[PDB]
C-alpha cells in the first residue's frame, strides 16, 4: 500500500562530479537511482518528497575506488504489498496459468487455481480472456483482488493474488 | 528653512560642497555642472533626510532607482559619523562610475575595428 | 545492542497487523523523534505525488476530468523527472483511475473523518482506498477490522464515504 | 465598443464586492449549520465555526425538533411551478442575448481573420520562408536575408 | 404579503401597561399573530373567565419552578388538540413557546417561537434558513460571473483572455560603485 | 499531434451535439425534480453559466 | 438539563455542512485570488468558477435530497445562548429572509412570465402548465429524433548491402 517513510541510501559519486554543484549532482543521482527503483525492504519507491531540503551530510572518500560515498537521508512515497491485503487493479495480461493484475507499479499474478470453478479460460477470444456464468475478466478490466502471498528480493517484489473470496473479483 | 539652516551651522562642510542654496523647505547642496541634491530635516536632533537629486552633467535626466537610492542615502545619513563627507564621497564616486560606464558604452558601440 | 540472531519471527500479514519490524506504528524520523506511521489512501497518495511533482516543477522553473487529468500529469511527469519512470507512470495512471476523491478538501475530510475513529493508519487507509458499500463487506475485505468497529458506526462512516464519492 | 481603465476598475470593484457578499452568505449558512450540528456532534461543528462565533457563543446553544410531516399544497405547487416557468424563460432570454452578442463579436473577428488570410495568400509566395516567433503571442516572421543564399 | 415565519413582533403598548415577565409570556404571546384563536389555551382561558410522564426534564424544571404552568398543564390534560406550552426559560428575558398537539398522553410537537426581550420570533425551518442564504449566494455569484464575463475578449491568435484597458542597469551601478 | 486533434474534434463534436439539447431539455417542470425556489434558481443560473 | 437534543437531524445537517464548507472554501479562494491587482490566468479562474458552481449544485442537490426533515425541523436558541447581548447575532444566524435584490428579481421574473395568479383561476393555471409541459415534451422528442437522424518498409537490408560492400557476397533473398 502507499506509505511515506524516512529513507537512507548510500550513494557513490564518481570523482568527475566533484564540482561546485556536487549537491545538485547528488540530488539528480538520487532521483534517477531512487525514483521508480524497487527494493524489497521498503517496497516500490515512487517519488521523493521534500526535494528542497534533502539531508546530505559529509561524504566519505572510498580508500581504493577514490569515489565519494554519501549517506543521503530523504523523504519518499513508497508502495509495499503485504500478505492478506485487498487492492484494486486492472488486468494487463492473460494466460492459461492465470492472469496478472496491475496495482500501482506492480503486477500481481493470479494463478489458475485461485478463481471460482465456474470461471474458465477462453483463448478463442481476441484478446484471450476468462469467462464465467455472470462476468468476464479481460484486458483493461477493473478487478479487486486479495494478495495472500508476497516475495521480496533485494531489487524485485512479486505478489500472488486470489479472488476466490466472496465480494471480490471484477468491479 | 530656518531648521535646515540652524542644523547646517553645527556641522562641518566639504570644500566642494560650500555651494548650498537655502530656500523652499530644504537645502540644495550643489556641485556646479555635476549635481544638485536637496535634503530636509525634521528637527534639530534628527539627521537629514533625502528629498531629491538632479544631475547637472550633460549626457540628461536619466531615470534612476529612486526608492532604493532614497533608502540607502537615508541609511548612510543615519549611520555615518560625518554625513556630509559620506554623502559627497558616495555621490561623487557614483556619478564618476556613471561617466566611466558611459564612455565604456560609447567604446563598445564604436565597434574602424577591434584589431 | 544485543547480537542475537533472532531469525524467528511471524510472517508479515495484513490481517494480524504485522507489516514488518520497520512498518511498525512508531517510526523514528530523520529528526530523531518518533512519529505515527504515515499510511496513505489512493487519492491521498495521488495528491501527495502530484503536489511533489508541481513543487519540483516550480523548483526547476526557478532554478477536473479523467482525460485532461491523464495528459496533464503525463506532461508534468515528462517535464519534471528524467529516466526510469515506467513504474511512476503506472502509479500515476493507476491513481488517476482508482482515485476515489478529487481535491484536497474532500480528501482531508476523509482523513479527519477517519481520525475521528482513532483507528489504525493501515486500516483507515484501506477504508479510504477500497470502494466498499456495506459493513459486512468491509469486515470480510479487511479482516483487521474484526472486533474493532461496531457495525452501525462502520455502515454510517462508509455511508458518508459513499456520499463523498464523486465523479 | 471601446473599454477604458475606469470602467474596468469599477467592474473589478463591483465583482469583488459581489464575491465578498457571496462568500459572506455562504459562510453564514455554513456557521449556522455547524452551530446546529454541535448540538448533537459537539466536535465537527466546532471545526466549521468561526473563531468569533466560538468566542461569542458556546456549542450546543441551539436545538430543533420534528414538526409533523406535511404535504405541500397544490396552490404553492403551482406558485413554485409558475415561478420556475418565468425564471427559466428569463434565463432563456439571457442565453439568447449572450449567444447573439458572441455571434456578432465572433463574426467581426472572423471577417478580420478571413481578410488577414486572404491578404496572406495574395501576398506571400512559396519561395518566401515564414516561421513562428514570440515576443508570448504568436507572430509570423518572414526571412529575407541572404545568409542562406 | 409578509409570511408569518419572517417577522419580529412586539406590543410595546402591552409592555408599557402590563410589562413582560415569566408569568405573562403566554397571554403576551396571545396578542401576536403567531397565536391561534382556536387553541385550547384560549378556550380554557374563556372557561376560567366563565411523578408524571410525557414531558422532558427541561419542561419539568419550568413546571416545578412556576406553579401557574402546572395549573395550565393540569387543565390542558383534560382536553385534546392544539395548544401552546412554554418549554425553556432564561430569567429575566428569554423564552421558548411551542405549538403542541396532545392526544390521550401522546404528544407531538409543532413550530416553535422564541422570545428575546419581549420581541417574538417564529422558529424558521433550517431548510428555509440555508435556502435563503444559498439564494443570496447564487444571486451574488451570478452577478460576479456576468460582470467577469463582461471583461472577457476572445482572440484566435492567442487563447481566450482578459480585455486590455485603453533603468535595468542601476543595480549594476550600485554593485560597481559599492 | 493529429491524434490530439482527432480526440479534441470528436469530443467537441459530441458535446456540441448534446449541449444545446440539454440546455433546452432541462427547461421542464415536474411535481428533473425542483421542489424549491433554490433548485429553480440554481438550475436557471447553471443554464447560462454551464451550457 | 439535557434539553433532549434529538429532533436535530444529524446526517442531513452533516452532509449539508460538508458541501457548504466546500462551497465556502472555494468562494474564499475566488476572493483572495481575485481581489489582487493582477488577475489570475483565465483558464484557472474558469476552472475555479466551475468547481464553485458544481459545489453549489451539489449542496442544492443534497438539500433537495433532504427536502423533508429540513422543512420539518424548526430551530430555536437555547437558554445558554447569550440572547440579550447578541440578539442581532442570533437573528442574523437564524434569518430566513433573503435579500431585497433577489426578491425584486423573483418578482420581476414572475411578472415577465406572462401569466400570473392574480387574474387567472387555479384550474386555468394547471391546464396552462399541462400544455406547457406538453410543448416541452414535444421539443425534447424533436431534439431526440433530430439527434438520432445524424451520426454521433525496408527495401533491403543495410547489413546485407554493407556486407557485400566490404566482402563481396550477394545479399540473401
PDB file of C-alpha atoms in Angstrom, chain D residues 130-142, chain E residues 157:
ATOM      1  CA  UNK D 130       7.987  32.147 -42.771  1.00  0.00           C
ATOM      2  CA  UNK D 131       8.456  30.986 -39.184  1.00  0.00           C
ATOM      3  CA  UNK D 132       6.682  31.470 -35.873  1.00  0.00           C
ATOM      4  CA  UNK D 133       8.052  33.868 -33.271  1.00  0.00           C
ATOM      5  CA  UNK D 134       7.151  35.086 -29.781  1.00  0.00           C
ATOM      6  CA  UNK D 135       7.649  38.403 -28.004  1.00  0.00           C
ATOM      7  CA  UNK D 136       4.375  35.272 -25.763  1.00  0.00           C
ATOM      8  CA  UNK D 137       1.986  35.985 -28.616  1.00  0.00           C
ATOM      9  CA  UNK D 138       2.339  34.157 -31.928  1.00  0.00           C
ATOM     10  CA  UNK D 139       3.677  36.194 -34.848  1.00  0.00           C
ATOM     11  CA  UNK D 140       4.707  35.314 -38.397  1.00  0.00           C
ATOM     12  CA  UNK D 141       8.226  36.394 -39.368  1.00  0.00           C
ATOM     13  CA  UNK D 142       9.448  36.262 -42.965  1.00  0.00           C
TER      14      UNK D 142
ATOM     15  CA  UNK E 157      -4.210  34.215 -32.416  1.00  0.00           C
TER      16      UNK E 157
END
